[PDB]
Paper text:
Computational design of KE07 involved construction of a theozyme to catalyze the chemical reaction, which was then grafted into the scaffold of imidazole glycerol phosphate synthase (HisF) from Thermotoga maritima. Catalytically essential residues from the initial design include a base (Glu101) that facilitates C−H bond cleavage, an H-bond donor (Lys222) to stabilize the phenoxide intermediate, and a π-stacking residue (Trp50), which was designed to stabilize the transition state and favor substrate binding through interactions with the aromatic ring of the substrate. This initial KE07 design (Round 1; R1) catalyzes the cleavage of 5-nitrobenzisoxazole, with 103-fold rate acceleration over the noncatalyzed reaction and a turnover rate (kcat) of 0.018 s−1.
In contrast to the improvement in turnover rate across the first four rounds of mutagenesis, which was unambiguously the result of reduced activation energy due to changes to the local electrostatics of the active site via mutations within and near the active site, the catalytic efficiency of R5 and R6 is improved by more favorable collision frequency (the activation energy actually increases). Thus, the mechanism by which the remote mutations that appear in R5 and R6 increase activity is qualitatively different. This is mirrored in their location within the protein; in contrast to the initial mutations that affect the active site directly, the mutations in R5 (Val12Met) and R6 (Lys146Thr) are remote from the active site. We also solved a higher resolution structure (1.61 Å) of R6, in which the active site of both monomers in the asymmetric unit were observed to be fully in configuration B, with the imidazole ring (an analog of the benzisoxale substrate) of the histidine tag of a neighboring KE07 molecule in the crystal lattice bound to the active site. The anomalous KIEs observed in R5−R6 correlate with the increased sampling of the alternative active site configurations.
Author numbering: 2 to 263
The structure:
Amino acid sequence: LAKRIDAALIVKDGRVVEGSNFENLRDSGDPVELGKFYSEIGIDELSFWDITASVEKRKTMLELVEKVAEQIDIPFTVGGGIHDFETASELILRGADKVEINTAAVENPSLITQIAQTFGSQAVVVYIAAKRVDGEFMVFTYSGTKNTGILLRDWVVEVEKRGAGEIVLGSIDRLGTKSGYDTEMIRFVRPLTTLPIIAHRGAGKMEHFLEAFLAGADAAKADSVFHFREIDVRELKEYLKKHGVNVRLEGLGSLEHHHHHH
């Protein structure tokens, strides 16, 4: 019944892709300052999703993880093309609370178990990109481009069996949309796993988060809707609490310039 609000930042070469509209920041495209800003206004957890193309990706992600852990105190996940145990191991040891895998786990589900055996299930996030194909939810890999022919219902069960800690459920059918989370897909997955389910893609307004939690999501992740300020994070948490959703609010408070405190 406790619910989580997460912000995700897509990063390339240590930069926020397409930036943000927070001109109060010294550099609105710097993922550490943006991430620290989110942790101060009330985001519960962060995801840093790297799309660095060329041969610099591994070093780039280790450098990001290093800088994030030194400045940021809320949990964060790194993801985006993490392909084996040694890469994931390096990133956790460098300071990431959680590592997210997708394509590599679909192709080699043993990878889930290998990470969880050393670092515990709570360190493992599996991102599942799913799409309706001929009346069935399917799993897509390679940045949503490869139909694996694997059914979502089968993969969710296998992901829990292999030892993942939580699932991010990203609806390709909502990619870039603003009409709501894929609540039908969330409801479809909810009876199939006891793991935390994190909704991703489709958020356009505050009411969409309420819908996702009524559908059984344990957490809701968004990116552009926060970065370009269509939704204010504190306003969202106040709205959710007002309508009965158990979000984390008492741990915040100081954002209205209330007198002074030395």
